[PDB]
Design a protein around this nucleic acid. Structure first.
Length: 183
DNA sequence: TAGGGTTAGGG
């Protein structure tokens, strides 16, 4: 069976009145939920405004994401691929981004190589193989922009990505200032 | 809108 982590969705912006039962009731429309819960304050037992839903298969997860926008208990919520506790440590880990940093690509890497691997994740809007200003030399990394944040999330939650025959590190793109803040 | 007593022993 597929890994729990890839079968789980983080549901953000939950209404103050959303409960395990009401959440389950809504998301159950796209599959069998093996787990459904609203995080609450360990003390006040008040809802922290977010929860998690886990389907029996990632296919069902995809159905749910393809069903956006979602409105639960009269409120628009934000469903996202669950970022593991380990990766949640990374700066910007939970931000909604459409651009990815692709690091460690060969010198002879060309745009078709990137498309042949990334198009299966979603509509690609921009592709940029970075070069040195003035030297024209390839820097060994590229940026790819999609039209849906879920395309990016489906990517970054995986460990390996093969472009132009070899593995590369793919992470959410961080702005110039976001970089220096986490530097 | 980022996790539910869910993360380094003892040889």
């Amino acid at each position: 069976k597929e890994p729990e982590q890839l079968r789980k969705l983080f549901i953000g912006g939950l209404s103050f009145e959303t409960t395990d039962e009401s959440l389950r009731s809504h998301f159950e429309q796209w599959g069998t939920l093996t787990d459904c819960v609203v995080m609450r304050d360990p003390n006040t037992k008040r809802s922290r405004g977010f929860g998690f839903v886990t389907y029996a298969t990632v296919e069902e997860v995809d159905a749910a994401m393809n069903a956006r926008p979602h409105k639960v208990d009269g409120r628009v919520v934000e469903p996202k691929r669950a970022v593991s506790r380990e990766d949640s440590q990374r700066p910007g880990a939970h931000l909604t981004v459409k651009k990815i940093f692709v690091g460690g690509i060969k010198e002879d890497t060309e745009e078709h190589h990137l498309r042949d691997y990334f198009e299966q994740y979603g509509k690609i809007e921009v592709i940029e193989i970075m070069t040195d200003r003035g030297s024209g030399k390839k820097r060994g990394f590229a940026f790819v922009t999609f039209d849906d944040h879920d395309s990016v999330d489906k990517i970054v939650i995986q460990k390996y990505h093969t472009v132009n025959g070899h593995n590369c590190e793919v992470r959410k793109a961080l702005s110039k200032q976001e970089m220096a803040s986490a530097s």
